[PDB]
Amino acid sequence: GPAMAGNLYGRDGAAIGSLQKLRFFPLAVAGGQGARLVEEDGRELIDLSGAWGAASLGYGHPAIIEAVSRAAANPAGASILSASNAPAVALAERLTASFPGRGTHKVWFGHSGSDANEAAYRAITRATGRTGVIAFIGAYHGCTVGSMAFSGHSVQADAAKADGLILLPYPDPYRPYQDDPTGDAVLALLKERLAAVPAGSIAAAFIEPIQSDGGLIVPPDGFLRKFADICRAHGISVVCDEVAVGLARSGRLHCFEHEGFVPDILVLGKGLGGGLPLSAVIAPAEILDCASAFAMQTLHGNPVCAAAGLAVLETIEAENLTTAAERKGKLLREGLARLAERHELIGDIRGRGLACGVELVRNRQSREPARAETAKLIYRAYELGLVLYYVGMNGNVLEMTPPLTMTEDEVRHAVNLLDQAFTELSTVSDTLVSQFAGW
Amino acid sequence: GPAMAGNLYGRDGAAIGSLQKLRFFPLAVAGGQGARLVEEDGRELIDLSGAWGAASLGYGHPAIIEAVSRAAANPAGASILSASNAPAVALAERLTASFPGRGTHKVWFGHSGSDANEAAYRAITRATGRTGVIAFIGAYHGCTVGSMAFSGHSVQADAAKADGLILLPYPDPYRPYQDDPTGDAVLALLKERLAAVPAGSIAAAFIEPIQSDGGLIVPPDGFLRKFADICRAHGISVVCDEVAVGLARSGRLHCFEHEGFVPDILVLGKGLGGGLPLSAVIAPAEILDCASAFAMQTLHGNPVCAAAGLAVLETIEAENLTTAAERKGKLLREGLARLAERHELIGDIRGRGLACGVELVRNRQSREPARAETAKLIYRAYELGLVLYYVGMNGNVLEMTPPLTMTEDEVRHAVNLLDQAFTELSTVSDTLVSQFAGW
Numbered sequence: 062g063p064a065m066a067g068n069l070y071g072r073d074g075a076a077i078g079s080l081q082k083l084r085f086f087p088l089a090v091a092g093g094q095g096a097r098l099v100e101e102d103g104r105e106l107i108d109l110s111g112a113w114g115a116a117s118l119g120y121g122h123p124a125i126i127e128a129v130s131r132a133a134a135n136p137a138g139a140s141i142l143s144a145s146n147a148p149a150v151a152l153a154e155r156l157t158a159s160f161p162g163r164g165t166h167k168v169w170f171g172h173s174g175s176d177a178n179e180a181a182y183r184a185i186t187r188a189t190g191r192t193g194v195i196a197f198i199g200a201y202h203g204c205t206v207g208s209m210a211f212s213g214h215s216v217q218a219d220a221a222k223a224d225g226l227i228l229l230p231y232p233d234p235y236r237p238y239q240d241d242p243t244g245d246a247v248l249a250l251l252k253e254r255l256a257a258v259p260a261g262s263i264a265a266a267f268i269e270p271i272q273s274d275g276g277l278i279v280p281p282d283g284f285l286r287k288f289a290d291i292c293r294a295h296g297i298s299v300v301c302d303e304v305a306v307g308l309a310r311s312g313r314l315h316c317f318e319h320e321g322f323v324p325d326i327l328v329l330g331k332g333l334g335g336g337l338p339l340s341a342v343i344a345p346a347e348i349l350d351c352a353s354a355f356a357m358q359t360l361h362g363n364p365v366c367a368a369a370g371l372a373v374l375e376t377i378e379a380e381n382l383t384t385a386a387e388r389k390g391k392l393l394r395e396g397l398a399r400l401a402e403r404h405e406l407i408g409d410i411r412g413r414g415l416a417c418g419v420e421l422v423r424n425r426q427s428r429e430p431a432r433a434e435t436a437k438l439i440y441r442a443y444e445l446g447l448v449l450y451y452v453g454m455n456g457n458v459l460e461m462t463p464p465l466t467m468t469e470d471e472v473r474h475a476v477n478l479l480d481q482a483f484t485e486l487s488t489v490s491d492t493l494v495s496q497f498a499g500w
Numbered sequence: 501g502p503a504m505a506g507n508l509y510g511r512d513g514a515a516i517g518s519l520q521k522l523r524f525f526p527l528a529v530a531g532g533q534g535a536r537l538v539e540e541d542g543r544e545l546i547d548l549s550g551a552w553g554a555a556s557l558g559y560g561h562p563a564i565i566e567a568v569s570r571a572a573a574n575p576a577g578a579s580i581l582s583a584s585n586a587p588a589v590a591l592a593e594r595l596t597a598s599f600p601g602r603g604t605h606k607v608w609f610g611h612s613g614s615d616a617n618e619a620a621y622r623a624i625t626r627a628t629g630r631t632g633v634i635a636f637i638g639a640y641h642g643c644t645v646g647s648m649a650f651s652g653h654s655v656q657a658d659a660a661k662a663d664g665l666i667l668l669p670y671p672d673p674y675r676p677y678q679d680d681p682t683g684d685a686v687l688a689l690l691k692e693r694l695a696a697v698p699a700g701s702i703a704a705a706f707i708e709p710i711q712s713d714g715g716l717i718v719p720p721d722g723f724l725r726k727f728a729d730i731c732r733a734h735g736i737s738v739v740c741d742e743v744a745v746g747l748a749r750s751g752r753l754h755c756f757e758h759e760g761f762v763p764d765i766l767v768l769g770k771g772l773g774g775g776l777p778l779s780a781v782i783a784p785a786e787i788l789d790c791a792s793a794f795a796m797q798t799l800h801g802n803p804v805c806a807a808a809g810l811a812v813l814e815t816i817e818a819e820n821l822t823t824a825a826e827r828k829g830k831l832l833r834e835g836l837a838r839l840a841e842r843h844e845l846i847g848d849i850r851g852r853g854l855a856c857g858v859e860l861v862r863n864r865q866s867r868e869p870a871r872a873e874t875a876k877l878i879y880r881a882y883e884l885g886l887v888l889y890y891v892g893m894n895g896n897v898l899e900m901t902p903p904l905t906m907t908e909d910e911v912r913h914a915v916n917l918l919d920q921a922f923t924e925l926s927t928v929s930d931t932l933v934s935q936f937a938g939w
């Protein structure tokens with residue numbers, strides 16, 4: 062009753078509406094250091110989710126502290142709309158320099174992935190005068206009217222969709238569409254769907270190079286390249302959404318580096334900001350210059366957020382985090398393989414760098430999803446002092462996206478906590494887990 | 501050529517797409533202190549726009565520095581979605597405590613005004629299962645697909661509009677609809693429009709208590725109260741958008757305090773964040789609890805942004821800024837009245853606190869808007885070291901929304917720079933002003 066209602070979690074219930082909440086257990090945070098969160102009572106936890114990938118440098122990283130304090134004390138105004146400002150320009154410069162399109166592309170800045178996907182779509186349709194768009198079932202591209210319009214994930218399933226939207230199955234090696242582990246069946250479908258619409262009616266294609274919230278799915282080898290070829294054959298812009306899986310997390314700087322294509326447009330978000338809201342679209346000049354005063358919010362490109370972004374990119378260099386994500390990802394995936402030797406629930410282990418997914422199944426032959434078991438597992442992890450969540454259209458993929466700065470010892474220890482969670486998930490009752498709405 | 505292209509402004513052109521730009525002159529900022537901006541070359545300017553109202557506490561205010569550094573060094577994670585966090589909860593607590601609905605309302609957090617208006621609409625329609633909405637011509641409620649749907653300003657004029665949207669004329673004492681300075685003609689229209697739709701089909705009404713970008717219009721006395729009565733008679737939720745004109749700027753904490761009604765929903769933004777992206781919807785519980793995992797972005801309610809918000813509210817108390825905005829607004833408006841004795845171009849002076857508008861006309865009898873003259877005026881102000889912009893559906897209202905911390909001497913000096921701009925606006929050529937796209 063009153064003590065529980067009076068604590069930070071119970072206060073959260075009383076003050077903050079459930080509209081934006083995605084809660085699985087009563088995590089109630091008052092501080093953070095490194096890869097640790099600190100609850101109101103002082104209890105420490107290891108954040109395997111790394112705030113869903115946003116805490117790219119963990120919590121209280123010196124580079125973020127310095128850049129944000131400096132920017133606070135001497136800000137170049139508060140916006141990029143009606144002034145140029147030094148940090149946003151230098152950020153935009155560094156991002157386009159990182160991209161193979163350095164010679165032909167510019168940047169738009171936003172507050173979130175949703176903002177950024179929304180802008181890219183609006184810009185392509187504006188530039189092009191066409192409405193049609195290809196995206197994937199399971200694809201999470203935002204939670205705003207404009208971004209949910211071409212999303213395919215459960216969260217957006219009730220949302221109004223874009224005129225000319227074609228949603229395709231994302232090819233899952235673990236559950237392959239039409240039993241084809243190559244994904245060519247999806248490409249054949251695409252072509253067939255394209256033959257049924259007017260020539261040149263599709264302007265855009267959205268893809269995640271790993272589908273994150275749809276269930277950490279690394280698509281079959283060659284699939285994305287061949288997908289991009291088709292798009293290019295029809296003059297369709299390829300937009301790569303690397304809001305979850307970009308900027309060093311995959312063990313390459315840009316996830317598309319694993320996949321033998323370069324996108325026309327690259328979308329970035331979450332960890333770009335290091336804990337502050339920051340997003341960007343890197344796209345051909347003629348796309349982002351087709352209009353002005355068109356996709357704008359007052360605080361877009363504010364210097365504190367832009368300084369945080371520069372800090373993240375600078376730290377990716379200084380601490381060699383692209384290599385560190387590769388190295389620690391391998392370690393993490395190896396620890397998980399050892400868990401699979403002990404716990405039959407583990408049906409699959411997948412991912413690249415520190416974007417890792419573990420799929421849980423009731424039987425390894427049937428692959429029946431283990432939804433109830435997954436929900437309790439993460440609850441028991443939280444009790445044990447490990448934060449991670451589940452994703453996927455079946456509620457049954459554990460997601461791991463820790464800060465790129467997480468140490469090797471922390472990885473080892475997260476795997477051991479995970480091991481104990483597997484051993485103990487049914488100590489969590491149905492009634493307890495039922496209290497949290499989840500997805 | 502190359503020197504100009506190499507400077508901060510020319511670099512802005514090369515790196516950042518025009519999509520989000522709203523440029524009137526080549527302002528190119530590298531720092532900021534108090535109510536001053538500092539350009540790349542070191543030239544200082546007084547920021548009368550206060551970054552469009554976002555720089556509520558000016559630049560480098562000690563309270564914002566401290567709160568943002570503290571939060572950076574020890575963040576309570578990075579989000580409110582899958583954890584409660586201490587700064588967001590305390591912010592939400594303080595905001596609901598400020599509102600007359602303290603007993604019945606909760607908070608949603610967003611990144612921008614657009615985000616926040618979008619959420620409120622989606623929440624009302626979700627709670628209610630109705631789509632219809634009332635808003636005003638000239639009303640700027642956002643620049644995202646979901647917020648432009650019930651906006652009425654030029655920026656959103658091409659955007660897809662909400663099914664059941666009714667757009668009304670906003671009653672302008674200076675140009676009154678149907679020659680009725682009371683606004684009752686607008687209310688009569690509303691009722692007539694409402695008689696033509698099915699009973700209970702309209703869920704929401706959006707209003708700015710002063711219309712800001714539609715031309716700093718303070719509506720006639722009693723109009724908003726009577727408008728709210730009608731809405732209430734039809735069970736329609738009144739959403740008050742105080743993203744531009746809220747939190748002390750009007751000389752009361754909440755602008756609706758001037759207008760004899762309490763809204764059902766209050767929307768806040770811009771200056772709430774003090775230079776960081778922050779917004780909030782304060783709305784009845786049953787509206788914000790009608791769903792979960794519904795209107796969510798990863799970095800919503802991040803602690804750095806929430807700490808900045810707490811700093812702003814705390815500074816509004818410590819420095820008594822509600823009174824300071826009233827006092828300095830009066831001063832500003834008096835200086836402007838003296839300008840009107842010298843410059844026939846000044847047709848009207850209006851506003852409340854430090855939300856002030858000056859309407860420029862070719863002739864005071866005709867009230868013909870002076871669009872070209874306004875564009876040059878602000879260009880000449882920029883040259884002289886004063887930043888302010890124009891708004892309004894006729895391009896002819898100078899807007900003044902300086903930091904609430906701007907000193908009385910700075911006000912006096914801004915008025916003198918303004919005086920010289922009026923005296924010298926035609927020193928600016930057509931060719932020079934033409935280089936900037938504006939709205």
Ligand SMILES: Cc1ncc(COP(=O)(O)O)c(/C=N\[C@@H]2CCCCNC2=O)c1O
Nearest residue numbers: 358359552612613614640641642712743744
């Ligand atoms: C009354 C009112 N409500 C909502 C908004 C939207 O806020 P965001 O730009 O933070 O999305 C605005 C925002 N901005 C306009 C337009 C472009 C930037 C300059 N200032 C504005 O007031 C507003 O004035």
Ligand SMILES: Cc1ncc(COP(=O)(O)O)c(/C=N\[C@@H]2CCCCNC2=O)c1O
Nearest residue numbers: 113173174175201202203273304305797798
């Ligand atoms: C691939 C991909 N693209 C776009 C987004 C949208 O980003 P925002 O939540 O910052 O608007 C997401 C964002 N977020 C989901 C869903 C709710 C919060 C947790 N993590 C996600 O990845 C994403 O994963």
